[PDB]
Symmetry: D3
Subunit: 260 residues, 6 copies
């Protein structure tokens, strides 16, 4: 549609990548109500589209996302935050079945780090910094700033970042485990598009099952996790792309997956 806060387009080879660029160079990409609504609409459109296989979330060259609009949730009370239409649609990023890649090429503070951690793959540049400055305004994160950051990085560094609001570099985030690959600030979008193409080049149902299996590592135990993994591996024998890949590996050729 005519999105004013974001720009959703079809990039990549053969138009198989859904690029959502936060276009707002006036408030460091403040996650307001309209921006979040447009982001959710674009995510739903890319999920319902059969051509888009992967989604790539990218911000500006100076700030990825500074979080929610502090100038909007200021005059809010306990009732208007516990039962209202404010700050409710924040879990739509984790409900999609297709993989989402977060390309952080700048400042990612508050809600930005949360949206980055809610994705599957986190690509950051050299001039990218992550922090939790909520403690600077007498508030705490509310979208996984203390849950995913602790389980992915650690207890000590997460405690420090939450209680002090200190900014960490991309090298420290890669050494800890926050991000997976450091790319230049000019070719970060290109590497994200290439990764999305490599992901979308496989069977969509198998990719979704693998994503669910990986996400089950933070909601279940090790024994039950392995049991569910075995169950999904056994259920994967009901598709046609599996036998196609097996025959391609046996005959030493390329597997032509048909998403079935």
């Amino acid at each position: 549609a005519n999105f004013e806060y974001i720009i959703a387009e079809k990039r990549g080879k053969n138009n198989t990548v859904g690029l959502i660029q936060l276009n707002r160079p006036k408030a460091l990409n403040a996650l307001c109500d309209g921006l979040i609504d447009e982001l959710n609409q674009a995510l739903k459109t890319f999920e319902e589209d059969p051509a888009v296989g992967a989604i790539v979330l990218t911000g500006g060259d100076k700030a990825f996302a500074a979080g929610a609009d502090i100038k909007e949730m200021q005059n809010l009370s306990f009732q208007d935050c516990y039962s209202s239409k404010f700050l409710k649609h924040w879990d739509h990023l984790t409900q999609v079945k297709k993989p989402v890649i977060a390309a952080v090429n700048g400042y990612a503070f508050g809600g930005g780090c949360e949206l980055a951690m809610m994705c599957d793959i986190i690509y950051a540049g050299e001039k990218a910094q992550f922090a939790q400055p909520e403690i600077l305004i007498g508030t705490i994160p509310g979208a996984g700033g203390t849950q995913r950051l602790t389980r992915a990085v650690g207890k000590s560094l997460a405690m420090e970042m939450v209680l002090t609001g200190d900014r960490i570099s991309a090298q420290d985030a890669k050494q800890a485990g926050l991000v997976s690959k450091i790319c230049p600030v000019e070719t970060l979008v290109e590497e994200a598009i290439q990764c999305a193409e490599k992901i979308a080049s496989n069977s969509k149902i198998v990719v979704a099952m693998a994503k669910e299996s990986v996400n089950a590592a933070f909601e279940m135990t090790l024994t039950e996790g392995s049991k569910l993994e075995k169950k999904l591996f056994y259920s994967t024998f009901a598709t046609d792309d599996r036998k196609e890949g097996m025959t391609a590996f046996v005959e030493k050729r390329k597997a032509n997956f048909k998403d079935q």
Copy 2:
């Protein structure tokens, strides 16, 4: 009070930091019954004091804490261990609501690493060493040596340190995620005091809520943890420090928190 094994003082800017220094060079700060009792008393005093906002735990320059006194628990039986009189007061460090910073200097083996991991922020010196020598004396850790270490560092290195007792440097601990920042041995206490001042400069109730949110990552699942984080973020709207910080951020000024 007149503590003989430890020294509890009030340091930092405006006397807002509680410094507990282990004074026992003849035994590498052996965690005996009297030392643990004095530590618990100092923690309770710093928790009941409204001026102290953060606590800093520091040992000696040659060794932080060599663990429990093996010479005292030598002539013990199975019946004497379930009798709640010998080794029960060990979880009080995890019962305090104010953040505790561990300044590790020198040898930190057994109980030292456990007390360091039970804190929120772990600061180690350039010559700091962590290990679990319990397997060298026919015992096993009992204060998080096999629970927090495995979740913070990993499975392989924790298994190696538990089954072999090998020592690790501060660089390896930072690479694996045990510590968050490496400071010199001569300026570690200063950095810990500065971090405590940066923590004690914000709202105490918000800091406690953030600490609880971070600690809820090892006891709950991802969805339940996110829901509890949302509930706490909504409850933060009932305090005045949140509104004060938001107004200060909007007006571009310094937020004056009153811990309310």
Copy 3:
């Protein structure tokens, strides 16, 4: 027995190490039915033997283990996979009480990386490459390739390796937390044997209790994990090796453990 796919021998000082070398330089150590059966038999023999205190798993110089045999599981169906003897005896590696050291040399794809992660200690060389290329053929990991890899390395890198199948180096594995030490390829087996000797030089029952305590960090919560750790520490006072080691530490001598 007359193993046709592996070589099980007794190495180390006083024959206290059980070395299982995958002898199959024709399919990159393809984990077929016979190879897995022989591996399980060797593990059971080393577990029943009182002299072997630790087991060392090692593959080939070019590749540790390519994974399950694709040519065998090609013409299989859902009903045929669910209720049969196809891919069922894969959890025996996690049922043994003695520590198992994984010496990975070369490629570790699919079943290889899973079997390496199911062990306690993971040792790799400079020319080591871990990956999970199940998505390239239309399948997913099914033996802990998405559960242990996510909890030990991280969410982002695990998602990337599962959805793309990229090759990671041993340095990145040590930085993330997959492997513990990086030894030369020509001396990795010697280092693994030395580690197995250092592990088997202690009390076997205490080593098993410590292994169970460390494994309980992924199956239980933090509070219940600490409770079970305290219970096991209290139960360790019923053996003679504990008192022997304590008396040796007090008298400053060597502890002569008797595995009792």
Copy 4:
């Protein structure tokens, strides 16, 4: 709206009860796609309405709900069920924050028992019957037929009902713990409306908090459950209805809750 399968109306004194009656006597209230869509729309309408405080789900005088439409999902496959929009909008009943009362006045088999157990209060008539006949058609429950039934009734009776499909009376369901009250078939709707009025006469936010606290008993542990309960009890001191109720209890008068 103009519904063709259900009837959603406002019953009770002062129009505070939302009555949803399944109007389909020709198929025993078969849960088809249109019926589920209309039910979700009615639930959303009653949730967004500020006057309706409680919802009452009621079926027919002979059959409450005979499960999903078997004739519609007959010619379906694995891909048609997994990667499509077939049998997906079934958790919305668990997403509403207002209490929902299930009035079973007849046959509740398959999806009917699942929808009844997904509600908060279950009222069954004298002729009400509960069973799991999926095993009679080669399928299994998929909306809590094996999760909530086992935790609310017991392992033995749930196993029996799932593996045999045998029906149970209202007396056995009340004795086991499936239902709370047994009312005649002529006054069941009246008792349901009275219970909804008794629920919709208090503070809506406190009712939602209590509902979340009760629902958290099947998602977390006992210690973390009690911690979350304490946190919610502390957060309840931020509303105006609590102080009004306390003042009314002290002054021995009636509390005029304003839902704030």
Copy 5:
């Protein structure tokens, strides 16, 4: 000590039972600060005494306990309730290692039921009534009134009692699974004393281990619970009372336990 709100005494055969009677008829045994302090002191005294093997909690003939004092927590704010000064010493009843028997007589509303649910054995009278009247004043339970009640009784009846504040009889409580034995109100104290004597006649350490094993059924999964139960059963062989009872069963004589 000279308790004013409660009466703690040593009843039973050979003074092996600790009886705590709530003496407050003018307020239906309102759980105020002084009453809770005296109860905690009596519990500590009975726990430190080696002769008392079991504790029996009993209230008045007209009402067991009407809960906390609403007149004291009326003019309280969020900051006052969140601080560790009001409503904090409520988990001590769950911290004792000796079994506690709850004798319920008359009205048991709010905490009077919550404390009753925090005990091991719940003995109710013929004129006993359990309810949760928190929604009538605008509050919610906070001491395990929505966690244990839901797991023990059920989801539907707990939801009804929380959202409506309805009173249930002792027969309905036993049918649902709240209490274990119904005794007359004139001889309930005698039956409780007899049960405490039957409990305090066995090995105290084995009784404590069994209590921990039973309490560990709501904190972790079934497999981990069974493994911890096996570990505790294996550790029980390190005592002398186990072998004494086994020899007494073999030699057909009475087992003379020595609490060791």
Copy 6:
């Protein structure tokens, strides 16, 4: 084989039921090493047999199972319990995929109640009695006596039965939730055989999936439990018996399941 302690036979219509009768009247069916070994062998044989679809466990007319042999584990120490020679093959009853029915007649104390609760369906006679008399000999249950009994019956009654060893009748067990249905002592075997026939008359793979779904209610949460249930329901569409039954239901005929 020539089983001396038990008797395994093929009963039921068309020999589709596996009946294992405990033959040991001189010791009240003491669960010794040989008896447990024969039971495990019979269970494995009935699991590998394609004709048997359900297993029925039945004891004697005067006593079902009086637990493990106390006269055999008397002269055992702490070191003899952590080995792999005594009391290890007790979890084989929960590893089978086919349903197991427990016909309880007479006294079922200690291991008998544990083996009964480890089954899916528990059928008890009019004279059946359940108790946990381990506390009478200074021991504790170790095979689910404090884990499954607490979750299936409740906390209070389980605590009472564990700390006092009191016996309960079949009526109290059915009222609490321990047993499913009560049958006469002379026709209990016939009802068990009829239930096994009704269970085996369906698709074996679907029955196994349903059993796994029901067993998952004690190992995972409600959300992940429902997710796994949905996944298994989606995977059920990959079988032929599913479509056969869904077609026979529409055609109003008998579904001829082919176990595929």
